[PDB]
Amino acid sequence: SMEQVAMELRLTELTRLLRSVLDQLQDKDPARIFAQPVSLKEVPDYLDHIKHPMDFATMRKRLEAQGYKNLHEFEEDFDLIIDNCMKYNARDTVFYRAAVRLRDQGGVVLRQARREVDSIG
């Protein structure tokens, strides 16, 4: 149907905008602390602590499969990155502090993304 195509074009355009959002958020992690999944070879107990691991490479895979239907879903995954790190790592660590700075800086980006998503539809 033409209606299915139109919905598919809207998903494609959302995917374009989410890719640019993802790029912008990941620039706020210049240490690449959140670039890849926590390695279970190197942190073998991680899944005892963190039930839903997340990282920017894993988000990028989902994004490229057009797997985010709306901005809320994408933000959920970004918040997991931050929130998982702030639980596993203590306050006095470079990891925790990196998460705080990514959260604070990414808030700005996400604020205008929400306006763009609403605006363009």
Swiss-Prot record:
Component of some HBO1 complex composed of KAT7/HBO1, MEAF6, ING4 and BRD1/BRPF2. Component of the MOZ/MORF complex composed at least of ING5, KAT6A, KAT6B, MEAF6 and one of BRPF1, BRD1/BRPF2 and BRPF3. Interacts (via PHD-type zinc finger domain) with unmodified histone H3. Interacts (via PWWP domain) with dimethylated and trimethylated 'Lys-79' on histone H3. It comes from the Eukaryota. This is Bromodomain-containing protein 1. Scaffold subunit of various histone acetyltransferase (HAT) complexes, such as the MOZ/MORF and HBO1 complexes, that acts as a regulator of hematopoiesis. Plays a key role in HBO1 complex by directing KAT7/HBO1 specificity towards histone H3 'Lys-14' acetylation (H3K14ac), thereby promoting erythroid differentiation. It is found in: Nucleus; Chromosome. Coiled coil: none annotated. Residues 9-113 form the Bromo domain. There is a cross-link at K41 (Glycyl lysine isopeptide (Lys-Gly) (interchain with G-Cter in SUMO2)). Highly expressed in testis. The chain holds residues 555 to 674 of 1058 of the full protein.
